[PDB]
A paper describes a structure:
Here, we visualize, for the model phage T5, how host recognition and SE can be achieved via the interaction of different phage proteins with the same receptor in the Escherichia coli outer membrane. Our structures show that the phage lipoprotein Llp exploits the known allostery in the plug of FhuA in the opposite direction as during ferrichrome import (i.e., from the periplasmic side to the extracellular side).
We succeeded in solving the FhuA–pb5 structure via cryo-EM, using complex purified in decylmaltopyranoside at ∼3.1 Å resolution. The FhuA–Pb5 structure shows that pb5 is an elongated molecule with one end inserted into the extracellular lumen of the FhuA barrel and with its long axis approximately perpendicular to the OM plane. Pb5 inserts four loops (numbered L1 to L4 from the N terminus) into the extracellular lumen of FhuA. With the exception of EL1-EL3, all FhuA loops contact pb5, resulting in a large interface area of ∼2140 Å2 as analyzed via PISA. The LPS molecule that is present in FhuA X-ray crystal structures is clearly visible in the cryo-EM map. Combined with data placing pb5 at the very tip of the central tail fiber, and the loss of tail tips when detergent-purified FhuA is incubated with T5 (13), we propose that the disorder observed in the pb4-interacting part of pb5 is caused by FhuA binding and leads to the dissociation of the tail tip.
Author numbering:
A (entry chain B): 41 to 328, 355 to 361, 374 to 427, 456 to 487, 494 to 641
B (entry chain A): 20 to 714
């Protein structure tokens, strides 16, 4: 029972249909079937670039565009707003995602119903009363937190509970995805807007080709009741998307606006799916033109940093561990330094599944207060492994801090550790991310990055209204304090058959956050000849 | 019967309506004055209770609270429940919770001016203003000592000494002070006040009167300034009972202090028969520090919709748990006002002009170091079995609370010209005033500052036909402006909320009978009012308008040498003419019908010579409890008695021992509500045994 590649389907990467930067191509019918109708089959995707660089997808990635404000005049009113934009990819540093070609529009527009789509979440709340804290009602309504700070609780029966079928996830297999897009940059941390859907309006998402728009507008006729709204929409990842009459006027009191994506400098040109005979059963794997996997096509597999601390203090982009067309590991692009690229060996004419598979559920809400790693989990089982990131709960888009958990819990002066999700209902969507990973002894292998550009907005640059400083020491001049963070999950080989999981955060202008671990059913089977 | 020729003869002359000493018949607006004799007769706790029997003013809106002299005159108040009181023609310019309050014992005359009178007093509320003239020194040696011992442990000791330093009376002084110490009606709250007003007057001749006016007041504990829910005060609690009238929802360590140090003068000088100059200035350094936990309606209130403490309650118990909030405020207000007037009394043929040209400068700086406890900041109070616990205010949790540090700067320079042209009997009072009102506000928490410089011109044209018999019909259109303190979606302060009024009425003030019957029918509109945003935002917007058509009848008449009837009536049809959420609604705390009637009989012949048994009953009609008009506060009729017997018959001439019983029937009534969460219980029956000795 050796790990071999039975089928290998390659294709080019087109740029038509207004893609611009999304190098896309329809997956082969066999690859489409194995990605949607046969999720439990470990197929390795390899991206070949215009420079000859070869890279294998390994690990998830994320990008948020959170923007929160808490203006309040204790005699007149109080207003809140939280506009997040979660875009995720199927590769650690590339922007790899799947979409259905049947959707009408350009290639970025086609992504509105595929993965790599900016899942925007909005919560506009407020009240015209004396010493009202209805600024924090949007956080209570949008985020399903047990509790961490102080304020209001909005029951799930009242507020908006997004169905799990309405949020696309890179590696979602229950959907129909017959095309794949790969962009040389990272996930689009599209930062725009500060408020959820506007009540007394239609609630339509004006600005980008949105889809799956869900709104819950609480607009009672009583003028002395805290009105709020919650909105979710899947929109264009390359365009500013906002709710009607709630655009971002780009003031100095509101931070910048932009579709942030840190380019690695490489341009994809070919995609190859290596259909291994590894079938994932749920607690490991079982063995079911013919290529074999070894540790002579050397394909870059992952990165192996000596220490989890990137030491960048901000958006810490990891370079893509590529391999030139001369069988030599290298790293292209990236901000973090010191990484070592590890390469698999694929050849056509024999590593075998080692008995014993370890699995863990990365559950918990680790509260961060500055750049520093933490041991967030362990795996109970050479450093050659095959890993599947099974998301049993739709909290992957709640992973990452600041605008993804509840940007009103930072006010509390204690360790929150509160279960603050995004209110995503059910888990009726198969979310699986198969990947082969090399784990050098002692070195840390990242497999999940949550690079996030956030702004603590101030709405008004006026002395009457005091903006609430959520994740900053203060808001001098009532200007939006742009922040950055690069929450990264590292998989390290301890050497005693214990694959420890380390989460490292790299903040900038952010005092701290809560990073809800995304309930990943991490399943590792060590393979070695 | 000192108030006899004082409420009907000495009350005819007033200097608030036209800023010149003219009879109220020659003032083309509704103006009511109460002389110091009426103040001594009624012995009010504040100026509000002194203005109980004057039409157009709702003085009992806050109930038992005596914290501020907040008057809803003609259905209109200042910006954000602020004060619009003037002391010596100079505004007691207070901001936020720092509002100046002057004890009625320490005033010689309180002239309430109704309607837009911004033509002389700068920015002002459209309803009007209150002018509380200080007790100027008297040339006749007066040494008065007064003791007020009453219910609620009220032990007020006061004195009033005035004497002429020299034989000719050139140097005269008046050192009047008091020291009151009473427990508020609400159980736990105490009201203390220590006020002193040393006054010095210099009179070189009968032309110049330079009187130095100061007023130092220290209130270690102001009293109760909290809110109560409509569910327990107006409406019965879910068990069927009601909140007791002595219910204090604050913490066991509620604190509310005030400290006023006002120093100024009132300078008068008559050059000739055609040129007399006046100048009043006053620097007031007001400090207030409050640690108050105020109720915010029961947990079933729409405002406390989610309110986690309320949410965790059982659904049946959310209707009687009072969700509250706390405020920790500390201020220091340095107010400076100057009002220089030049009154040129000249004639042009037959017409006799009194051309008042003046310059008025008012400057207020108010720093605020306040911390506000937002929703879910203090534990809920179980109204069934309330427990008073020492809520610490230093534990300022930023999750449910936030600082309010701001430096409110306000400045205003006003140049006004007023011409009281009297031809035959057609007195045409035409005035105008240009105000350069500037306002700054530095949010010290963030650092932002916003500035607005308003140049608003207001004018008043009134015509009075003084008939020989005594009835003087008058009509007048008077303008007002009052700049807003709020900013819009753009962060810019709004335009001033201008106020227009067309008032028609008569003032039967005969020169022979002691009757001051007054009527007035007005159409007072406050344009440019701030309403909720038409779109889905919680900011404010211009364009709102509150219009109030009313009819006011006042009757001050000494029917006989003993009887003295001082009544009033007020119909107020206030309404939001233009609004987004309250269009057509009647403003809260504005009763449609207000009536009052004070009759006192002073025995002069017989075994009971000296008694002043006077019974007065103030009626307040039903008022809407919130701007949304969801509920109406019931109408109440409070009856105040008075048994005063001077001691001249005993031998101590001038000394009188009185017994004032406010709310004689001890009616348990909710005074008013500005919203479903804020309601104020009315003052219970209160006897006050006053003994003012002219030692
Ligand atoms: C002979 C006939 C009568 C003739 C009468 C003629 C009078 C005419 C006066 C007109 C001008 C005026 O209005 O005069 C006022 C009132 C003074 C009393 C008046 C007489 C009353 C009674 C009159 C007499 C009755 C009979 C001054 C004032 O109000 N001052 C208060 C001040 O705030 C106002 C300031 O800004 C304004 O302009 P803004 O910048 O805001 O725009 C002013 N400009 C104007 O008005 C111009 C105006 O528009 C032009 C138009 C004029 C019209 C004239 C026409 C009419 C003429 C008529 C003829 C400016 O005045 C001046 O510039 C001087 C001059 O104008 C006055 C001189 C003459 C009068 C005195 C003699 C008295 C006359 C002689 C009497 C014997 C002033 O300085 O804050 C101080 C505290 O500061 C701090 C502290 O650290 O805590 C720090 C500070 O920070 C800062 C900071 O910001 O400063 C910044 C930091 O970076 C850092 O640098 C930090 C630094 O470290 C710090 O050094 O400073 C800040 O944080 C604050 C915080 O806000 C807390 O609130 O706190 C207070 O101290 P406190 O509270 O701690 O003690 C202080 O109160 C105290 O002084 C007041 C003390 O009362 C007593 O003495 C009264 C005694 C009376 C006698 C008793 C009876 C006798 C028997």
């Amino acid at each position: 029972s050796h790990v071999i590649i039975t089928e290998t389907h390659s294709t080019g990467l087109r740029l038509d249909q207004g893609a611009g930067d999304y190098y896309w191509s329809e997956m082969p019918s066999r690859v489409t079937q194995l990605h949607n109708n046969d999720p439990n089959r470990v197929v390795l995707t390899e991206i070949e670039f215009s420079d000859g660089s070869r890279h294998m997808l390994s690990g998830m990635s994320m990008g948020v565009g959170a923007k929160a404000y808490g203006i309040i005049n204790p005699q007149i009113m109080s207003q809140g707003g939280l506009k997040t934009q979660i875009t995720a990819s199927a590769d650690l540093s590339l922007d790899v995602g799947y979409f259905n070609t049947g959707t009408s529009g350009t290639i970025p527009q086609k992504l509105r119903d595929g993965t790599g789509c900016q899942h925007m979440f909005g919560a506009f709340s407020g009240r015209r009363g004396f010493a009202s804290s209805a600024m924090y009602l949007g956080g209570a309504a949008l985020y399903k937190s047990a509790w961490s700070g102080s304020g209001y609780v909005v029951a799930d029966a009242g507020t908006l509970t997004i169905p799990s079928d309405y949020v696309r996830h890179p590696g979602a297999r229950n959907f129909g995805f017959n095309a794949i897009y790969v962009r040389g940059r990272s996930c689009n941390r599209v930062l725009y807007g500060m408020e959820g859907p506007n009540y007394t309006t239609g609630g339509a998402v004006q600005g980008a080709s949105s889809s799956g728009a869900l709104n819950f507008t609480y607009n009672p006729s009583n003028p002395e009741s805290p009105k709020y709204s919650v909105g979710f929409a899947r929109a264009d990842p390359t365009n500013y998307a906002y709710w009607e009459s709630m655009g971002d006027p780009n003031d100095s009191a509101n931070g910048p606006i932009g579709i942030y994506s840190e380019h690695l400098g490489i341009y994809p040109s070919k995609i190859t799916w290596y259909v291994t005979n590894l079938v994932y059963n749920g607690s490991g794997y079982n063995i079911d033109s013919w290529k074999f996997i070894n540790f002579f096509r050397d394909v870059g597999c992952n990165l192996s940093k000596d220490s989890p601390s990137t030491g960048i203090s901000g958006i810490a982009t990891f370079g893509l561990p590529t391999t030139e067309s001369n069988n030599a590991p290298s790293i292209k692009g990236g901000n973090v330094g010191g990484l070592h690229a590890n390469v698999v060996s694929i050849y056509n004419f024999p590593l075998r599944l080692l008995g014993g598979s370890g699995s863990t559920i990365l559950s918990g809400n680790i509260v961060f207060q500055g750049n520093g790693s933490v041991h967030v989990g362990t795996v109970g089982l050479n450093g050659a492994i095959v890993c599947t990131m099974e998301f049993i709960d739709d909290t992957w888009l709640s992973a990452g801090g600041i605008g993804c958990f509840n940007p009103t819990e930072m006010l509390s002066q204690g360790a929150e550790y509160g279960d603050s999700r995004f209110r995503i209902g059910g888990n009726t969507i198969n979310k699986k991310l198969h990947q082969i990973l090399s784990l050098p002894a002692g070195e840390y292998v990242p497999f999940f990055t949550i690079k996030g550009t956030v702004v603590n907005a101030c709405k008004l640059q006026a002395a009457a209204y005091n903006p609430t400083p959520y994740w900053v020491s203060g808001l001098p001049g009532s200007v939006g304090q742009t922040g950055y963070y690069t929450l990264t999950y590292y998989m390290r080989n301890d050497g005693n058959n214990n694959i420890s999981i380390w989460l490292d955060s790299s903040m900038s202008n952010i005092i701290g956050m809560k990073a809800c671990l995304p309930n990943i059913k991490l399943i590792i089977q060590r393979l070695t000849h | 019967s000192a108030w006899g020729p004082a409420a009907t003869i000495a009350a005819r002359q007033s200097a608030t309506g036209t800023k010149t000493d003219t009879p109220i018949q020659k003032v083309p607006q509704s103006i009511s004055v109460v002389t110091a004799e009426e103040m001594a007769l009624h012995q009010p706790k504040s100026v509000k209770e002194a203005l109980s029997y004057t039409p157009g003013v709702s003085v009992g809106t806050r109930g038992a609270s005596n914290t501020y002299d907040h008057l809803i005159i003609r259905g209109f108040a200042a910006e954000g429940q602020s004060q619009n009181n003037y002391l010596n023609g100079l505004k007691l310019q207070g901001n936020f919770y720092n509002d100046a309050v002057i004890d009625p014992y320490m005033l010689e005359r309180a002239e309430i001016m109704r309607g837009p009178v911004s033509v002389l007093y700068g920015k002002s509320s459209p309803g009007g203003l209150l002018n509380m003239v200080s007790k100027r020194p008297t040339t006749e040696p007066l040494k008065e000592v007064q003791f007020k011992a009453g219910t609620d442990s009220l032990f007020q000791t006061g004195f009033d000494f005035s004497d002429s330093l020299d034989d000719d009376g050139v140097y005269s002084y008046r050192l009047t002070g008091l020291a009151r110490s009473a427990n508020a009606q609400q159980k736990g709250s105490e009201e203390q006040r220590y006020a002193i007003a040393p006054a010095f007057t210099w009179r070189p001749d009968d032309k110049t009167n330079f009187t130095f006016l100061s007023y130092f007041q220290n209130e270690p504990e102001t009293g109760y300034y909290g809110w109560l829910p409509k569910e327990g005060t107006v409406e019965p609690l879910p068990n069927g009972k009601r909140l007791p009238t002595d219910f204090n929802e604050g913490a066991k360590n509620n604190t509310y202090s005030r400290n006023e140090k006002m120093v100024g003068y009132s300078f008068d000088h008559e050059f000739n028969d055609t040129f007399t100059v006046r100048q009043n200035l006053r620097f007031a350094e007001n400090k207030t520090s409050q640690n108050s936990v105020y109720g915010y309606g029961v947990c079933s209130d729409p405002a406390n919709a989610y309110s986690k403490q309320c949410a965790a309650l059982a659904p049946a118990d959310k209707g009687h748990y009072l969700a509250r909030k706390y405020v920790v405020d500390d201020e220091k207000l340095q107010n400076f006002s100057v009002d220089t007037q030049l009154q040129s009394k000249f004639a042009t043929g037959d017409i006799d002009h009194t051309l008042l040209t003046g310059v008025d400068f008012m400057r207020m700086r108010n720093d605020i170091n306040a911390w506000f406890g937002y929703d879910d900041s203090v534990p809920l109070l179980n109204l069934y079995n309330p427990v008073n616990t020492d809520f610490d205010f230093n534990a300022k949790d930023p999750a449910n609370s936030g600082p309010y540090r701001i430096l409110n700067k306000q400045k205003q320079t006003g140049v006004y010209v007023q011409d009281q042209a009297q031809w035959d009997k057609v007195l045409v009072t035409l005035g105008g005033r240009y105000d350069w009102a500037d306002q700054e506000s530095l949010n010290r928490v963030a650092g932002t500052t916003d500035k607005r410089d308003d140049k608003q011109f207001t004018w008043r044209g009134g015509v009075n036909y003084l008939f020989d018999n005594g009835v003087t019909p008058y009509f007048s259109y008077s303008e007002s402006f009052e700049p807003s303190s709020q900013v819009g979606k753009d962060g810019n302060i709004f335009a001033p909320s201008k106020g227009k009024q067309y008032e028609v009425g008569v003032k039967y003030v005969p020169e022979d009978r002691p009757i001051v019957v007054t009527g007035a029918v007005y159409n007072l509109t406050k344009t440019n009012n701030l309403m909720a945003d038409p779109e889905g935002s919680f900011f404010s917007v211009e364009g709102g308008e509150i219009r109030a058509r009313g009819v006011e009848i006042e009757a001050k008449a000494a029917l006989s040498a003993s009887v003295n009837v001082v009544g009033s009536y007020t119909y107020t049809d206030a309404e939001y003419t233009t609004d987004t959420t309250y269009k057509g609604n009647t403003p809260a705390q504005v009763p449609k019908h207000m009536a009052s009637l004070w009759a006192d009989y002073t025995f002069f012949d017989g075994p009971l010579s000296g008694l002043t048994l006077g019974t007065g009953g103030r009626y307040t009609g039903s008022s809407y409890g919130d701007p949304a008009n969801s509920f109406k506060v019931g109408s109440y009729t409070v009856v105040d008695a008075l048994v005063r017997y001077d001691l001249a018959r005993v031998g101590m001439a001038g000394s009188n021992v009185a017994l004032h019983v406010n709310n004689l029937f001890d009616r348990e009534y909710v005074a008013s509500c500005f919203n479903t969460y804020g309601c104020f219980w009315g003052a219970e029956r209160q006897v006050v045994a006053t003994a003012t000795f002219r030692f």
